[PDB]
């Protein structure tokens, strides 16, 4: 659903800058 | 349908799962939504599912934070379910634990809280428990009222409470500031391999009971001190939760005759009291030494006594028993027999990678300014193990503090949160600390995984592809090679002229292969002839085998008729005690164990002709100067780091340099960079490399390789047709 | 076992001896096995302890009171013969002695088989591969092996079968099997404990591995087989056998496939010496371990005993110069020694083989030890194309391949030369059939092309010393 999809974009971002 | 095994985590973050795809299709959700977790004690836990390659079809992937909240370790199995039905919550109220609230005042929640709720959208359950780093400091926090229930995820605009004592940790939960596998950097290969012998006969000792496979009952560990061998023996017990029974040679030593040996035997008694459980014998070769190497009665006592408790393991029901020691032939060989201490693994020192994991592990609460660069420290800290590597982080985080926050505090135990968050640890800082540290391991042989690739070599097209052939082939085909009842090499040896690439070219393939490499010098085979210490040669098979797959890179392989003379010697041949049991090694190493020899020399008239015969370094290629178009090759390689100036002609460059070797062309390039550099740095007392910083760099660099020198690497060419 | 006798302390472990035995005699018959032998009675003149000199007296007033003690056998186990006191052996006591050794391949196989009887094995499973595969392993590293592979294959399983209890159920158990791939898996975890120990067994080189010779094939039957096929015959007509042959001429003709060919046909262990471990022996003052040799060749016999490069040590000592003494030395004294006090009726055959026969020390060839010689030339035309036709029987080979008409240019290549040959066309092969996934036999142009780079290994300034050499032999 939306909620999580927008919960999935947070968690991504800061795996990304992170290990980037 | 649904379970999955839990397994480890790449992504650290405290939401986040990963699953493979044919799992994500099981459960018919998509990457990004938001699943339910279910482990034991009827205790749960809320998180998103990604995807990557290295997570397998029957295991979840996930980190210390989801495994604590789901009272699960690592090996057991939860069910997952989606739970597309999740909304936004409206009031939460987190506090902290008291196990970490101390030393620390302040505003918690405006220093670690907000920060990790604020746009973050992270899925919460009440009673999860997860942790927030900073400011030099781990906390973690438990959720303890929400509006929605039994989950929610938090939005920006939710209102987050933090008011009340720290709460106590409660029986059912451990602390995530323990020691576990995250808290190991390099030697992650090693980790695997123990995992793999040990967490099934302590998490599940049902499956032995069960099924007729015997457990391992003892694993040796080996290498220098300070490189983790404690650590992986406590974090292990400390994942799998068997009790960890510390014992060490030296403290058991110290007791008087009968105190030593009842005290070794209760440690054993214990151990099973409180099965499972793990015994953890530290400097194994000072509580029990060579029998053949002492002289006392005590002395060969205690090692009776060793030797009778290891087999009484096989009564003890799920207990093994762990041993450190410096090295692996220091102890008495019975208790590497069948048995007892029948596994071992070698530890080893970190690579340059394993030292930037290190350093990134110490530095997980530290906050770091732009400038601080943990790669450029893990290449400067040669020798150092993990304890220099930990000081170093502590040294550089306390030096921050002096500088800054000393201005700000009172001189007593209890410091601000927000002080402490607004400090930065400086590259400086880490600088200061590699000048006060001094490697506790330089001398020892490191073996890593090498970064050069093909790329890193110029000229030499026809070589790179015979290694291909000789090494990868035997293994990506081996259906051709049956087919033709070929026998693949078992090595190569490389002549010619010093620094044409001969290590690149070992290098490199055991880059591509992701071997590790083994660099062996004529020094170490110089030593073992005239210490008569040739034992050292068994350990060098010994180590390729137990580092397969891996290059073993033999260099200087003249050393030894040299050290017969060389030039001048006796009247007899080459053949010696050291050739003698190396060629010996080389008969006994199977292809099947992923290990390849290769040799190197630079004066190849004199090499034993035993090692050129088939099953040995059969295999011939000479490596010479590099030619007009590989020396442009080379040049323009070893540029590729830095912006080159239109009016640079490498042409011209390689024209004049006939006479020089790839390690001389690189010289060449090197000092025109630095050239370029000094240029820059004084302008703002230059964006790229003038033509002038070559032509002057031509000024300095000379040919290593004299004519006389070339010309009797060709006639030796020529003799071989 | 000798860790739960030692340990204990002055009068402990005597009395725990001591029960022992007892024990036995009340629950008579029974047997005593003592394990680690070597670590309670170790040779007293090598130990000044007061515990060490008194418990191997114990022991061997146990050993003795067997005569009392009736209907009781007492088993030990040692790591070698010559690790314990040389009293226990005596008359008595532990008079008998079996050698166990290391399995060879076809006893592999076995433990192997025995280990997975309880074990499915899937379709793909060859035993025969692994047994050959584990060399130098013992039975508890095929135990290991086996144990390896079934947990490789457990987890593939047990991670999603979902089974978490005390029990399994014997559905789940009986659905799993293991793979080719989790024993090769495992082959390339476990490390053998006995791959640097003397293997000793009957070799697998038969008479059709060797390409030509056919005289020498027949030579040696007659030396190794008849004496022991017929001995009625050589008593008939007053035969004495010789113990051994030495081989000589150029290397890389077959001398070491010719002495194990023999030891096939006639079934008997082949027993391989090195020149690195004669040199090795002779560098490091350590001679006594040609005694240890020529013993294990008396227990293993029938067999046949080769020594390879016995010119090793005179090549070592330079032998066209060398220094101030001549040809003998400690290494080859001992073997003269062991030699003549050995009995030819204990169907141990000794072949030599040296490639430098000017340099070997006369008194190996006196009669009575190696008094026959045997010289082993450069293959002739008929028999090259018999050496390339043997080394190709492990390929497919193409119908445009002319084996006769490269014997014909390979003149002065030796066996090992074509060897060379026929494995650089395979290679060519492989290289090519790779390539086409990115044929399937070898063709006349892989092995055209391999002639570009195979060359003789002996050229004629040495052929002239082997014929001038053969020739003084008449
Ligand atoms: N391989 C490693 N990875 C991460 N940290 C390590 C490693 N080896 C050592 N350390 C760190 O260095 C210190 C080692 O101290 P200790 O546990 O006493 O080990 P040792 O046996 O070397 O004395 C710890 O702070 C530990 O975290
Ligand atoms: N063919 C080549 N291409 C690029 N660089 C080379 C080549 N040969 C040598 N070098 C440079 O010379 C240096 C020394 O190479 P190496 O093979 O270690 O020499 P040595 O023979 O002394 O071991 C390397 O660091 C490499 O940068
Ligand atoms: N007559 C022959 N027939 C077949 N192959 C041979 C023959 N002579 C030599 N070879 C090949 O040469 C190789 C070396 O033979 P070997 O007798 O071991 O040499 P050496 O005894 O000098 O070490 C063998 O592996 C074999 O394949």
């Not at chain 2, 403290?251 to 209760?266: H, Q, V």
């Not at chain 2, 990506?476 to 002229?497: A, R």
């Not at chain 2, 008569?532 to 397969?548: P, Y």
């Not at chain 2, 030039?567 to 041949?573: A, C, E, H, K, S």
Request: glycine share 6%; net charge negative.
């Amino acid at each position: 659903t939306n909620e999580a999809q927008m919960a999935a974009a947070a968690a991504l971002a800061r795996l990304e800058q992170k290990q980037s | 349908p649904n379970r999955l095994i839990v397994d480890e985590a790449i992504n650290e973050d405290n939401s986040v799962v990963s699953l493979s795809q044919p799992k994500m299709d099981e459960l018919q959700l998509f990457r990004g939504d938001t699943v339910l977790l279910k482990g034991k004690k009827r205790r749960e836990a809320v998180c998103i599912v990604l995807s990557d390659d290295t997570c397998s079809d029957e295991k979840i992937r996930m980190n210390r934070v989801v495994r604590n909240n789901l009272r699960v370790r690592l090996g057991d199995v939860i069910s997952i379910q989606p739970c597309p039905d999740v909304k936004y919550g409206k009031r939460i109220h987190v506090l902290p634990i008291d196990d970490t609230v101390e030393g620390i005042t302040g505003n918690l929640f405006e220093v670690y809280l907000k920060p990790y709720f604020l746009e973050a959208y992270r899925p919460i359950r009440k009673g999860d428990i997860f942790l927030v780093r900073g400011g030099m400091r781990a906390v973690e926090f438990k959720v303890v009222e929400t509006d929605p229930s039994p989950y929610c995820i938090v939005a920006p605009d939710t209102v987050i409470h933090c008011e009340g004592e720290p709460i106590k940790r409660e029986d059912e939960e451990e602390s995530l500031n323990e020691v576990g596998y995250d808290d190991i950097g390099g030697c992650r290969k090693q980790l695997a391999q123990i995992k793999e012998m040990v967490e099934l006969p302590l998490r599940h000792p049902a499956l032995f009971k069960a099924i007729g496979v015997k457990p391992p009952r003892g694993i040796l560990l080996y290498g220098p001190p300070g490189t983790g061998k404690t650590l992986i023996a406590r974090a292990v017990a400390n994942e799998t939760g068997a009790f960890f029974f510390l014992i060490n040679g030296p403290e058991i030593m110290s007791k008087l005759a009968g105190e030593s040996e009842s005290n070794l035997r209760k440690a054993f008694e214990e151990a099973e009291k409180n099965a499972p459980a793990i015994i953890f014998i530290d400097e194994l070769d000072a509580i029990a030494p060579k029998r053949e190497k002492t002289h006392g009665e005590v002395e060969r006592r205690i090692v009776s006594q060793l030797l009778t408790l290891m087999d009484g393991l096989k009564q003890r029901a799920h207990v093994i028993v762990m041993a450190a020691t410096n090295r692996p032939n220091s102890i008495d060989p019975a208790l590497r027999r069948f048995g007892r201490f029948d596994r071992e693994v070698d530890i080893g020192i970190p690579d340059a990678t394993g030292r930037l994991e290190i350093l990134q592990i110490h530095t997980k609460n530290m906050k770091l300014a732009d400038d601080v660069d943990l790669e450029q420290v893990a290449n400067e800290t040669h020798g150092h193990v993990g304890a220099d590597l930990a000081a170093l982080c502590s040294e550089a985080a306390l030096q921050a503090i002096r500088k800054k926050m000393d201005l700000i505090d009172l001189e007593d135990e209890t410091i601000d949160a927000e002080v402490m968050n607004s400090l930065a640890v400086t590259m400086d800082d880490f600088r200061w600390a590699l000048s006060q540290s001094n490697p506790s391991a330089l001398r020892e042989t490191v073996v890593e995984v090498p970064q050069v690739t093909w790329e890193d070599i110029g000229g030499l097209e026809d070589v790179k592809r015979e290694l291909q052939e000789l090494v990868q082939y035997p293994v990506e085909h081996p259906d051709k090679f049956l087919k033709f009842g070929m026998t693949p090499s078992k090595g190569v040896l490389f002549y010619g002229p010093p620094g044409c690439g001969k290590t690149l070219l070992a290098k490199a393939i055991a880059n591509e292969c992701q071997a590790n490499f083994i660099s062996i010098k004529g020094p170490e085979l110089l030593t073992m002839w005239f210490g008569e210490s040739e034992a050292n040669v068994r350990e060098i098979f010994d180590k390729a085998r137990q580092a397969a797959p891996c290059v073993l890179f033999f260099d200087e392989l003249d050393s030894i008729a040299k050290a017969r003379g060389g030039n001048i010697g006796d009247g007899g041949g080459a053949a010696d005690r050291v050739i003698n049991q190396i060629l010996t090694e080389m008969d006994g190493m199977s292809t099947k164990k992923n290990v390849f020899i290769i040799g190197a020399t630079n004066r190849p008239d004199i090499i034993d002709p035993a090692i050129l015969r088939p099953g040995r370094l059969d295999q011939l290629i000479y490596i010479p100067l590099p030619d007009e178009k590989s020396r442009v090759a080379i040049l323009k390689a070893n540029l590729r780091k830095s912006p080159v100036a239109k009016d640079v002609d490498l042409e011209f460059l390689a024209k004049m340099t006939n006479g020089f070797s790839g390690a001389d062309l690189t010289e060449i390039c090197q000092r025109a960079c630095k050239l370029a550099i000094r240029e820059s740095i004084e302008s703002e007392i230059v964006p790229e490399i003038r033509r002038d910083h070559f032509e002057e760099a031509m000024r300095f660099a000379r040919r290593s390789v004299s004519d006389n020198d070339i010309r009797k690497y060709e006639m030796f060419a020529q003799t071989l047709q």
